[PDB]
Amino acid sequence: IAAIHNARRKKREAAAAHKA
Amino acid sequence: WLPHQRKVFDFYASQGVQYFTAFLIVSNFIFNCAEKEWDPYTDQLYQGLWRWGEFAFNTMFLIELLINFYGIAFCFWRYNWAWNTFDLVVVAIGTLTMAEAIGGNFMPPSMALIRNLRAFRIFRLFKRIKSLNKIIVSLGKAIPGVANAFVIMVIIMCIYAILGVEFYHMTGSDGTYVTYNDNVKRGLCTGDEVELGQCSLNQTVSSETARGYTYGEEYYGTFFRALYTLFQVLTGESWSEAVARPAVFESHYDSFGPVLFYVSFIIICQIVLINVVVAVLLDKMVEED
Amino acid sequence: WLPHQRKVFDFYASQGVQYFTAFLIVSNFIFNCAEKEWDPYTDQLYQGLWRWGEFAFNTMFLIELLINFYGIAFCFWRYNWAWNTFDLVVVAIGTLTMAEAIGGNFMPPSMALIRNLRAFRIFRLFKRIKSLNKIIVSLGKAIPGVANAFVIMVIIMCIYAILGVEFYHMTGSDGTYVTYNDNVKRGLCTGDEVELGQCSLNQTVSSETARGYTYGEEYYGTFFRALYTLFQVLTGESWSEAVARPAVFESHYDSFGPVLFYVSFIIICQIVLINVVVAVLLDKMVEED
Amino acid sequence: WLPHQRKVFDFYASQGVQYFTAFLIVSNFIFNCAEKEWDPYTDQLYQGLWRWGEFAFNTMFLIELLINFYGIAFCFWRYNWAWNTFDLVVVAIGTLTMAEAIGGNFMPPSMALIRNLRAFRIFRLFKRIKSLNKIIVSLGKAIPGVANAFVIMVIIMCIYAILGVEFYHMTGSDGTYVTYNDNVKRGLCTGDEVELGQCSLNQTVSSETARGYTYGEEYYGTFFRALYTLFQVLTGESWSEAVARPAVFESHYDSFGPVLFYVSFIIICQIVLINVVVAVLLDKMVEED
Amino acid sequence: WLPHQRKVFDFYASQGVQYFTAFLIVSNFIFNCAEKEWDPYTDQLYQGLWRWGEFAFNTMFLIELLINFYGIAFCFWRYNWAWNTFDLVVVAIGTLTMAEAIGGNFMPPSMALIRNLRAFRIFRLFKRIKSLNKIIVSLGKAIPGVANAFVIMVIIMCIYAILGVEFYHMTGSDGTYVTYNDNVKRGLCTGDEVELGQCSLNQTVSSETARGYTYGEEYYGTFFRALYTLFQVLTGESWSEAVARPAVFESHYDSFGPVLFYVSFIIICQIVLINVVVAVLLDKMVEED
Ligand SMILES: CC(C)CCC[C@@H](C)[C@H]1CC[C@H]2[C@@H]3CC=C4C[C@@H](O)CC[C@]4(C)[C@H]3CC[C@]12C
Ligand SMILES: CC(C)CCC[C@@H](C)[C@H]1CC[C@H]2[C@@H]3CC=C4C[C@@H](O)CC[C@]4(C)[C@H]3CC[C@]12C
Ligand SMILES: CC(C)CCC[C@@H](C)[C@H]1CC[C@H]2[C@@H]3CC=C4C[C@@H](O)CC[C@]4(C)[C@H]3CC[C@]12C
Ligand SMILES: CC(C)CCC[C@@H](C)[C@H]1CC[C@H]2[C@@H]3CC=C4C[C@@H](O)CC[C@]4(C)[C@H]3CC[C@]12C
Ligand SMILES: CC(C)CCC[C@@H](C)[C@H]1CC[C@H]2[C@@H]3CC=C4C[C@@H](O)CC[C@]4(C)[C@H]3CC[C@]12C
Ligand SMILES: CC(C)CCC[C@@H](C)[C@H]1CC[C@H]2[C@@H]3CC=C4C[C@@H](O)CC[C@]4(C)[C@H]3CC[C@]12C
Ligand SMILES: CC(C)CCC[C@@H](C)[C@H]1CC[C@H]2[C@@H]3CC=C4C[C@@H](O)CC[C@]4(C)[C@H]3CC[C@]12C
Ligand SMILES: CC(C)CCC[C@@H](C)[C@H]1CC[C@H]2[C@@H]3CC=C4C[C@@H](O)CC[C@]4(C)[C@H]3CC[C@]12C
Ligand SMILES: CC(C)CCC[C@@H](C)[C@H]1CC[C@H]2[C@@H]3CC=C4C[C@@H](O)CC[C@]4(C)[C@H]3CC[C@]12C
Ligand SMILES: CC(C)CCC[C@@H](C)[C@H]1CC[C@H]2[C@@H]3CC=C4C[C@@H](O)CC[C@]4(C)[C@H]3CC[C@]12C
Ligand SMILES: CC(C)CCC[C@@H](C)[C@H]1CC[C@H]2[C@@H]3CC=C4C[C@@H](O)CC[C@]4(C)[C@H]3CC[C@]12C
Ligand SMILES: CC(C)CCC[C@@H](C)[C@H]1CC[C@H]2[C@@H]3CC=C4C[C@@H](O)CC[C@]4(C)[C@H]3CC[C@]12C
Ligand SMILES: [Ca+2]
Ligand SMILES: [Ca+2]
Ligand SMILES: [Ca+2]
Ligand SMILES: [Ca+2]
């Protein structure tokens, strides 16, 4: 789930950087 | 619309009334938990206590269900249908319970699993509290995304169950199986004493499980047995000591067969597929967030 | 304000003093670990060693607690209240320990679990080191988010515990249960030898656990037993070989009952709910980051 | 191009035809699952049922493979090569099965694992349904990223297997090993009764496993045995009670050896490396998303 | 600078030379794996094979280390120090191995664990292949971030080990312990037959483990035993059936003590701290990405 949570987070900042 | 229906309606929708109903729900749940804790026996010690507390809780649930329905003109089709029919079903079974408590065995002894539905009244609390509601709604809107990876998981487990019934359904059927030593090459014996009859290069091991079966009949005897066994392996439970290793070492030299069976299954299903299923689940939840 | 209080105050807040106190905390913790490693016996071999090292550490903790309090005018209400009362409690129990070491059994033998509180002085180190402080503060500000999914988890486990006490609290009560073969259809026997009395299609299996109980009394005998059992199943510990499979194969043809009980519980609680709980935990931590 | 080929081609590519083929695929899979569920025996009670249902399904698969090939001029090199050769292989083995059902043992008894390939026809469904296709394509384009961390994992497991064969391949070879008490220091006995011969500070423990071997031989007898054992430890299966603890307590005072072996392996491989492998897997999948 | 050094230097840095050295590294690793697979015995069957293949591989490693070192001017301080001293150490032990193979027992029998270092030459491959290098560098730059949460984990495990030695180091010291029935209330007996001496409400259960120890000594006998036991529980290995449940049911009515011990540990150390440690690990790796 830590592996899963980071994979999700990985996409979250990728979307955050896309908007930023 | 009935004459005094509007005020009963917005009164049942009061925060204080809903919190009191939540208190009643939680206290009924705790009453059932406490019944199982302090009187789980068949010959109960305080039977009237549970019986009449059940009666009282079912009465209050009936009463405030009627108060619920008077505000919607007893229709419950238009406003909040799903929760209303859940309440209707649970209080219908509760009134059935009041009838069992009062006036005879009008329910047949085949339908007690409907008498066990009291534990599920606590789900009405997930309607009262907005946080639990927010979590269960996220779960429910995420399950359909899990669906695809879940069915892939099930197909692969079913393939493995077919193969497992084909290969291992008769392993140890005699009740015993044979394993093979390297006692000579390991210095534990000489070739002369092996040829003489003093020691041996094979050992007869019993195949009976803790449930009275033999290995193959109990783990892969049928397709649903093998499917259950593979669900156990997916979780990772005693998958080697009870399941994999008897098959692995029953094979004298063909040990790569069972080894690769279990290793490939564990890798693919457990690691890859379980983690993809849970990843899809949590992704749909966090964009439910 | 006392006359020479300002300088004692900012001296106790010195980096070097706090690092020396951290050294003392860690060395006391190591002294306790070493006591358990090299003298865990009831008849200790070096009892004076542990007793007087305890005395010395408690003395130094008392002394620098007084140095702590002199800087805040002995009030400790205004400045850093939580840590200060934690220190006050631990050194109060330490002075109680000095009193036990010097002058008699003024503590009753019912309160030794307060004598065991020495292990928790190491938590004061989490105040000295900013990294451990940064991690425990993140943990603490994340727990309230876990709360909701945790209570949903507990409600579902409690439902399953109620059902488990209802279904399985009497499984194997005779001490044994019966399982059923397919020996004829599997070629291991003929119908003639089954009807003759030479082999059988059922086996009597003992239900006693390693703790002396029977299966039902030990896993679902009461509500808290069943709740403990479901926590164990929630972690995956021996959930099939010791818990699920005896119930599954005790059912002659109704095996879908226990199978679906355990499979549904494992799926829902263990996969979905544990992963949602941990996901919420880690999300709140990483935006604590 | 054959005269009436275009229309047969775009007719085989019809949504309704592909859904009917998917229905046939799923129903064949269910027929095989049901064969294993209701007739897994060697002496099958209903052999003609499975035999002729197999014949009928193989016939329909042959027929609509020919309908498939007539639309591509029987070439199947240019259009959709991979799926087409998968279909060709599965229906070739199915026609081989029809030949076995009709006219003799033209297949040798060494190649039954090709007769087991029927379970894998369900993979053709992953072509019909776009969701399963989308998931398996993501899996396949993610595996090459897993490759590197996987080979690092395998190298480390292989190092540990070499060391495990060196250290533990002869542990308990006598069939028994010795463990050591602290009975005197624990008050359970006096030094006088130890020197007298009434109690002892060592116990002889049997080293034989459930599969008939001794502890060293079964787990680390050879390199592939040790590699299998380390895969089992990598999954957490009984790694302490069956594997680690006998080695840990067989060492009188050198217990740090096996303890550090297993603790370092668990930490590095299990925690760090498995989580990195799965993290790479899921990252490549979610940017396959 | 030596006269013909430049060209030897950039020749050793050739892609083809480094790939040939990688082939040699991998083939030496495979030679060692194959030695453990096909000749793990003490009385080896092909001893000259392994001895002289070892000699040949060590010779080639010495030769191309000298070719390496020619390039760095035997300085190896300035260019690529870490890998160069790793190579120097491994080939120094390999030349020590050549000396053991040729001319006597100049190494004492206490230092064979240095003769086991051949398995670690494969780590030089992580220098040749850029992918394994990128993964191990990410691991190494992530470990220092793990450090803090790891030490918090260790502190909490050490607290629990201290408490476990205090509470459970003497559980079952007699070799047996007592558990308690509800046979009367469960209908399995009457109060009259309990008072008569025909049945009983307690059972004497043996406390001896598979390793010859009693339960308390084996798990919580000392601090490092308890720390090992808590590492095993952290993983989830047999933590209930072998560890938790004997303590839980040894307590007649105080079962909340051990239950809360193990449940809190699992909830704290295994559901929360392991996932934070792995989350920090993977975060530092993915921003190493
Ligand atoms: C509505 C909620 C609070 C129900 C739970 C609290 C009350 C109603 C329940 C929970 C625990 C129950 C008690 C548990 C067991 C005992 C001890 C026994 O010697 C007599 C009955 C008695 C005393 C029960 C009385 C009813 C009880 C007190
Ligand atoms: C996470 C997902 C992939 C796991 C899916 C596993 C499910 C689908 C499998 C695993 C074990 C299976 C069960 C095994 C045994 C039985 C008893 C049988 O008389 C009816 C079906 C039933 C109840 C099966 C239904 C399907 C089943 C529950
Ligand atoms: C990552 C895991 C699941 C994959 C492991 C692949 C390895 C172990 C598999 C792939 C092909 C297999 C080989 C193919 C079949 C044979 C021939 C047989 O007479 C001896 C074993 C042997 C030589 C197998 C050994 C195991 C094997 C090499
Ligand atoms: C750094 C300090 C504060 C932490 C603990 C270190 C010292 C004080 C502790 C730790 C280990 C302890 C030793 C462990 C066991 C022995 C061997 C025994 O034959 C005599 C006592 C003696 C020698 C103890 C003396 C005190 C001791 C040395
Ligand atoms: C996240 C999950 C594990 C939460 C559920 C676990 C907790 C809530 C459950 C699981 C096991 C339960 C315990 C089982 C047994 C006892 C002994 C009883 O005399 C008092 C309560 C107590 C101590 C229970 C308290 C609640 C309990 C700790
Ligand atoms: C995970 C899920 C989907 C697995 C399947 C669960 C349900 C749908 C399946 C699994 C096993 C099935 C049961 C098998 C046994 C019986 C008893 C029989 O007299 C009537 C059908 C009935 C009652 C079936 C009802 C449906 C059933 C309970
Ligand atoms: C949808 C189809 C293609 C998949 C399988 C369904 C049908 C064809 C299969 C599945 C279950 C099978 C049945 C399972 C077992 C029995 C009971 C036995 O006394 C006679 C044969 C009979 C009645 C089988 C007939 C064929 C059968 C009904
Ligand atoms: C997730 C990854 C890192 C796990 C990799 C484990 C794989 C590579 C290991 C673990 C167990 C190993 C197997 C152990 C036993 C045998 C039998 C032998 O006759 C052929 C090889 C074979 C079949 C091995 C192949 C490689 C193997 C499958
Ligand atoms: C990374 C750390 C925390 C893991 C533990 C490593 C420590 C405990 C290991 C590594 C080397 C080990 C020591 C090496 C030397 C010896 C041999 C003998 O004279 C007694 C044990 C003793 C003294 C070992 C005790 C444990 C030991 C110190
Ligand atoms: C690629 C190389 C360097 C790695 C190992 C390959 C070769 C050299 C190794 C690996 C397996 C080894 C063989 C394994 C076992 C046998 C069978 C035995 O009856 C004679 C020795 C013999 C034939 C060994 C010869 C050397 C061997 C062939
Ligand atoms: C959170 C992660 C890092 C788990 C950490 C657990 C580590 C630090 C613990 C768990 C088990 C412990 C070991 C238990 C037993 C021994 C034998 C003793 O003679 C020396 C120390 C040694 C070798 C301990 C060292 C520390 C240890 C390895
Ligand atoms: C947060 C969850 C885990 C709560 C469960 C743990 C605590 C709160 C509960 C669980 C079991 C409870 C204990 C059950 C048994 C006893 C012994 C009795 O003489 C006094 C009450 C006392 C001491 C209870 C105190 C509270 C208790 C310890
Ligand atoms: Ca049997
Ligand atoms: Ca009993
Ligand atoms: Ca043997
Ligand atoms: Ca003992």
Author numbering:
A (entry chain E): 2 to 21
B (entry chain C), C (entry chain D), D (entry chain A), E (entry chain B): 69 to 357
What's the publication's text?
Interestingly, we have recently described an unexpected N-terminal helix (N-helix) mediated N-type fast inactivation of NaVEh from the coccolithophore Emiliania huxleyi, which is mechanistically distinct from the IFM-motif mediated fast inactivation but similar to the ball-and-chain inactivation of potassium channels.
To assess the potential Ca2+-dependent activation, we measured NaVEhWT currents in the presence of Ca2+ or EGTA using the whole-cell patch clamp recording of HEK293 cells. To further assess the potential regulation of NaVEh by Ca2+ from a structural aspect, we determined the cryo-EM structures of NaVEh in the presence of 2 mM Ca2+ (NaVEhWT_Ca) and 2 mM EGTA (NaVEhWT_EGTA), respectively. The resulting two structures are essentially identical with a root mean square deviation (RMSD) of 0.37 Å, and only subtle conformational shifts between the side-chains in the extracellular loops (ECLs) of the structures can be observed. These results confirm that Ca2+ has negligible effects on the function and structure of NaVEh. Within the SF of NaVEhWT, four E305 residues are properly orientated to form a ‘high-field strength’ (HFS) site that attracts extracellular hydrated Na+.
